[PDB]
Amino acid sequence: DIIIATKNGKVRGMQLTVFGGTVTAFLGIPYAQPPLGRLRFKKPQSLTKWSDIWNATKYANSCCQNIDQSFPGFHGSEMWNPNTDLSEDCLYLNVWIPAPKPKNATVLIWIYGGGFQTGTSSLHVYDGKFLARVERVIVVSMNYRVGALGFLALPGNPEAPGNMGLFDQQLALQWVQKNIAAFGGNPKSVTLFGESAGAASVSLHLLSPGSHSLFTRAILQSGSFNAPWAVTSLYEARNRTLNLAKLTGCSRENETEIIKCLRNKDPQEILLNEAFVVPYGTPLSVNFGPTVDGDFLTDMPDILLELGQFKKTQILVGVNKDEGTAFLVYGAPGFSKDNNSIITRKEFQEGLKIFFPGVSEFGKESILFHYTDWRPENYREALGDVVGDYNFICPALEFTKKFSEWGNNAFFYYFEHRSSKLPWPEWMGVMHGYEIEFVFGLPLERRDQYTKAEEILSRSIVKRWANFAKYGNPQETQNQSTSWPVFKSTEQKYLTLNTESTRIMTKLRAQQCRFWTSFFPKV
Numbered sequence: 001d002i003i004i005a006t007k008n009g010k011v012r013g014m015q016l017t018v019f020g021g022t023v024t025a026f027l028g029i030p031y032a033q034p035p036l037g038r039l040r041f042k043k044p045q046s047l048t049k050w051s052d053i054w055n056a057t058k059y060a061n062s063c064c065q066n067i068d069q070s071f072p073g074f075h076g077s078e079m080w081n082p083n084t085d086l087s088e089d090c091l092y093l094n095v096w097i098p099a100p101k102p103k104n105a106t107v108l109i110w111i112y113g114g115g116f117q118t119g120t121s122s123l124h125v126y127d128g129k130f131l132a133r134v135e136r137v138i139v140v141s142m143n144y145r146v147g148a149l150g151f152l153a154l155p156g157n158p159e160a161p162g163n164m165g166l167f168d169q170q171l172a173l174q175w176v177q178k179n180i181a182a183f184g185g186n187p188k189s190v191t192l193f194g195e196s197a198g199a200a201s202v203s204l205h206l207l208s209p210g211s212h213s214l215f216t217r218a219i220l221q222s223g224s225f226n227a228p229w230a231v232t233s234l235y236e237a238r239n240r241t242l243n244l245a246k247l248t249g250c251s252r253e254n255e256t257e258i259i260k261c262l263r264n265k266d267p268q269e270i271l272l273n274e275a276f277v278v279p280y281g282t283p284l285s286v287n288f289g290p291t292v293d294g295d296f297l298t299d300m301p302d303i304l305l306e307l308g309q310f311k312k313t314q315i316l317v318g319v320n321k322d323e324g325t326a327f328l329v330y331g332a333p334g335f336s337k338d339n340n341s342i343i344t345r346k347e348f349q350e351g352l353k354i355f356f357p358g359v360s361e362f363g364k365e366s367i368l369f370h371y372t373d374w375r376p377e378n379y380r381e382a383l384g385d386v387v388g389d390y391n392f393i394c395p396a397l398e399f400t401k402k403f404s405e406w407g408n409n410a411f412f413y414y415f416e417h418r419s420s421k422l423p424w425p426e427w428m429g430v431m432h433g434y435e436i437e438f439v440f441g442l443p444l445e446r447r448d449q450y451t452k453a454e455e456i457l458s459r460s461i462v463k464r465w466a467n468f469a470k471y472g473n474p475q476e477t478q479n480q481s482t483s484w485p486v487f488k489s490t491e492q493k494y495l496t497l498n499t500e501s502t503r504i505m506t507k508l509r510a511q512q513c514r515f516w517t518s519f520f521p522k523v
């Protein structure tokens with residue numbers, strides 16, 4: 001029986017056998033008061049002491065959210081749906097400890113993504129026991145409120161101030177600072193890492209003064225705040241809050257009475273109406289996301305980044321080869337996960353209005369012109385690259401450029417290996433989200449039918465990530481590997497991650513990102 005005494009009381013963990021060794025797991029530690037009743041839409045309130053022993057022996061509830069019901073029975077989509085009961089009572093965290101108890105281990109804190117509308121830390125591919133066993137680091141992950149329950153915003157109104165889900169994450173970071181020493185962790189060696197909206201979350205913690213003292217450095221996989229889906233303008237935030245109030249019959253003159261009306265509605269009523277607060281949407285639309293609240297975010301994040309107002313530390317940023325392909329089967333005509341999705345030129349143009357609804361005709365023709373300088377799968381591949389470059393790759397590169405211009409070491413990766421167990425079709429390639437299982441070390445478990453080369457790749461990736469967390473330098477020193485060079489604003493070197501051979505290259509998607517970052521904002 002391994003019991004740890006935290007600042008709020010004792011917690012009961014459990015022992016797991018991993019690779020002939022042992023890992024101690026504490027699943028479902030509460031880190032905030034359940035945000036129920038009057039506490040809905042408010043910032044997380046801090047927890048009070050319990051006099052007995054909390055059993056942290058199973059994953060806790062996942063936060064309320066809508067489910068991906070596009071492909072029932074299909075593992076490719078269902079593997080991302082929550083695997084615990086949905087509940088407003090969801091502010092819990094998990095911690096994996098190596099055995100025996102480490103003296104002063106570096107801590108990795110995972111922040112899941114999902115467009116700020118879905119996600120949970122209990123997913124199979126977020127299992128931190130492998131990292132704890134192999135690299136003897138401590139892995140922490142938390143659930144944070146998503147959707148309107150986590151990001152509904154009436155700016156300046158403390159009953160719905162916005163960024164509540166970001167304050168959830170932040171309170172979990174504070175929990176680590178206060179308690180991780182009792183688990184054998186080093187509160188001064190804390191690395192945040194996250195993917196998609198989690199990576200954008202990580203990037204905003206770099207911008208938020210309240211988070212600066214709560215971590216050491218940061219890893220951003222397939223996401224950043226400057227992505228076009230990652231931040232909602234305060235006009236849109238107000239317009240979407242008033243729309244959900246209208247859709248639920250909560251339209252009141254007093255803005256505070258609107259919120260209180262929303263606190264009496266059942267969570268499913270909120271969730272059902274979340275999709276309709278915008279006129280038109282895209283498969284990447286974030287209805288309720290981060291806002292400039294004057295609290296977590298003191299100013300528009302583009303200004304803070306441009307003017308060097310962020311935590312000065314090392315960062316690790318990267319993207320996958322085909323970030324955009326996943327979203328094409330969620331609206332683009334002629335696309336299907338069950339055939340090769342050979343589309344015509346006309347279907348490509350119809351594809352553009354799905355992902356760029358409010359853009360002018362000249363703007364969409366400029367996208368078309370730029371991506372058609374060439375094969376029957378030309379247009380299919382072009383649309384995937386349009387969606388992936390615009391929503392993920394080019395913003396990530398721009399974030400890395402602007403961050404590194406203020407003197408800090410930055411490292412950029414280009415992940416381009418497609419999992420041998422990938423359930424989606426071959427034309428989708430190296431999809432959004434499918435580097436996560438390599439980072440968490442699933443292919444190190446050889447009983448799960450990954451290839452030998454995938455075990456080697458995951459082992460190398462795991463070592464690089466752990467070395468970055470512990471030493472701020474993501475090298476694999478022992479096995480005659482390729483040295484990972486610093487990303488500088490001029491050379492813009494990056495490392496490719498795959499099974500055959502790592503390579504150092506420069507200026508990823510240089511032509512494409514000049515279009516998206518410099519020209520396309522003008523249309």
Ligand SMILES: *[C@@H]1O[C@H](CO[C@H]2O[C@@H](C)[C@@H](O)[C@@H](O)[C@@H]2O)[C@@H](O[C@@H]2O[C@H](CO)[C@@H](O)[C@H](O)[C@H]2NC(C)=O)[C@H](O)[C@H]1NC(C)=O
Nearest residue numbers: 235236238239240242243244246247275276277278279280
């Ligand atoms: C600000 O919100 C309004 C209201 O949104 C309404 O329209 C749907 C999205 C639906 O969910 C409904 O319940 C909701 O109340 C938006 O107004 C709409 O805009 C579209 C296109 O401009 C029109 O087709 C609608 O007729 C119009 N509705 C009204 C009542 O005027 C408005 O677009 C939005 N602002 C922005 C910038 O998107």
Ligand SMILES: *[C@@H]1O[C@H](CO[C@H]2O[C@@H](C)[C@@H](O)[C@@H](O)[C@@H]2O)[C@@H](O[C@@H]2O[C@H](CO)[C@@H](O)[C@H](O)[C@H]2NC(C)=O)[C@H](O)[C@H]1NC(C)=O
Nearest residue numbers: 329330331332333334335336337338339340341342343347
């Ligand atoms: C690849 O499949 C898409 C999707 O087709 C859907 O509907 C059925 C026809 C089914 O066979 C299955 O493929 C999928 O659930 C094809 O597009 C569809 O094609 C038909 C014409 O045959 C149209 O009437 C549909 O509206 C259209 N749907 C969409 C969303 O585009 C596509 O033609 C196919 N490509 C191939 C076979 O090369």
Ligand SMILES: C[N+](C)(C)CCCCCCCCCC[N+](C)(C)C
Nearest residue numbers: 068080113114196283326330432433
């Ligand atoms: C957005 N909608 C719901 C319309 C479609 C989402 C389709 C997602 C398919 C998985 C893509 C990778 C996801 C990785 N995670 C879940 C971590 C983001």
Ligand SMILES: *[C@@H]1O[C@H](CO)[C@@H](O)[C@H](O)[C@H]1NC(C)=O
Nearest residue numbers: 001012052053054055056057
């Ligand atoms: C926690 O688990 C232990 C396991 O032996 C059990 O004895 C105890 O009653 C549990 N606490 C509860 C259920 O509150």
Ligand SMILES: *[C@@H]1O[C@H](CO)[C@@H](O)[C@H](O)[C@H]1NC(C)=O
Nearest residue numbers: 103104105185186187188189
């Ligand atoms: C853990 O390491 C830090 C340096 O990062 C040090 O300041 C601290 O005293 C250490 N704590 C221990 C050894 O308990």
Ligand SMILES: *[C@@H]1O[C@H](CO)[C@@H](O)[C@H](O)[C@H]1NC(C)=O
Nearest residue numbers: 252253254255256257258260
């Ligand atoms: C809105 O309601 C709050 C809560 O009672 C109140 O303090 C405030 O004065 C009201 N605003 C008005 C009446 O304009």
Ligand SMILES: *[C@@H]1O[C@H](CO)[C@@H](O)[C@H](O)[C@H]1NC(C)=O
Nearest residue numbers: 456459460461463476478479
């Ligand atoms: C280095 O190579 C050895 C075998 O040569 C392997 O067992 C080990 O896991 C590798 N380590 C990393 C970090 O790749």
Ligand SMILES: [Cl-]
Nearest residue numbers: 321322416509
């Ligand atoms: Cl490529």
Ligand SMILES: [Cl-]
Nearest residue numbers: 450451452453
């Ligand atoms: Cl093999």
Ligand SMILES: [Cl-]
Nearest residue numbers: 480481482502
């Ligand atoms: Cl190598």
